[PDB]
């Protein structure tokens, strides 16, 4: 046994977070904030944009990771997300904006790194299928397997994914206990704030035939 | 989306996402005890935070500065209440 899962049925998941060659400190801090939360992931930096998309696959095969979260930077100003099942599974592309990182002293919330989250989804993540595919991809990227030996055990935070206009808004809150008056959970927000606008669904790993197209996207 | 009237209402938009993670947290807590795991961190688990400790030190200093400004301004009120 090599997958370090102590559970009745092992959820073998790994992610590989990556960066482009021109990200900003705001996009760099979202690597550090997301990877700190994400206990079964490896950090890597500065993928060559002159390479091809499917060289992100054997990069992840080199590190035994079935998920990849790529931060691609264009113009030195714009963050673009990529969630993908590495061998042959589907992928996604987002435009990320309205960034607010953990280093900014205005959130007043904190939690253990590596602790297991609760995934707080939205109602439209169930009824409409283009939200459903990214739902399973979000759930796998933040999978945090059961018997993972790098995970701290007590649960104190919940990740909230909600769609408002056409865009998904992420939220992170800390579970805190205040006793009821003759204990209820009060949420204090911890970490990353970003707004996630879908762009495409591709049926391949990083190419493959196009499945969803967001025909309302105003590019920067 | 039905909870949010206007997307520029920062107070209501924050409350809507907070309310969404509210019933997720209470429902998850109920199901987690029914199966049964250690859910709440005890007083003795000195475990490593997702944030740097010094970051909490400067955010504790900022909460000092905001709250001490409010009460010192109230002392300025009482001085000028004597003035009138």
């Amino acid at each position: 046994d090599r997958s370090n899962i102590i559970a009745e049925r092992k959820n073998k998941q790994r992610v590989l977070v990556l960066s482009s060659r021109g990200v900003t400190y705001r996009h760099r801090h979202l690597l550090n904030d997301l990877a700190s939360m994400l206990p079964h992931g490896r950090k890597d930096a500065k993928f060559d944009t002159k390479s091809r998309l499917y060289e992100l696959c054997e990069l992840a095969e080199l590190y035994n990771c079935n998920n990849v979260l790529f931060f691609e930077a264009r113009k030195g100003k714009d963050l673009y997300m990529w969630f993908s099942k590495v061998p042959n599974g589907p992928t996604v592309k987002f435009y990320a904006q309205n960034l607010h990182t953990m280093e900014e002293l205005h959130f007043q919330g904190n939690c253990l790194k590596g602790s297991r989250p609760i995934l707080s989804f939205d109602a439209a993540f169930e009824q409409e299928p283009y939200l459903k595919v990214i739902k399973e991809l979000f759930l796998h990227t933040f999978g945090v397997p059961q018997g993972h030996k790098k995970s701290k055990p007590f649960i104190d935070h919940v990740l909230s994914f909600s769609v408002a206009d056409g865009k998904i808004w992420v939220r992170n809150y800390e579970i805190r206990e205040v006793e009821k008056v003759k204990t209820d959970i009060n949420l204090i927000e911890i970490g990353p704030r970003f707004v996630l606008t879908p762009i495409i669904i591709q049926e391949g790993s990083f190419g493959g035939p196009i499945l969803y197209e967001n025909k309302r996207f105003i590019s920067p | 989306e039905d909870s949010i009237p206007q997307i520029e209402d920062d107070l209501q938009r924050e409350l809507a996402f907070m309310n969404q993670a509210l019933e997720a947290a209470r429902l998850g807590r109920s199901l987690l005890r029914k199966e049964g795991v250690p859910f709440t961190r005890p007083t003795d688990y000195f475990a490593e935070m997702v944030r740097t400790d010094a970051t909490m030190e400067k955010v504790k200093q900022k909460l000092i500065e905001e709250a001490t400004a409010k009460k010192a301004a109230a002392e300025a009120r009482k001085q000028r209440d004597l003035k009138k």
Partner: peptide, 15 residues
């Protein structure tokens, strides 16, 4: 009551 919540479908269903 004969109603519980399904986490994976987000609905209410009977026992």
């Amino acid at each position: 009551r004969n109603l519980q919540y399904n986490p994976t479908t987000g609905q209410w269903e009977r026992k």
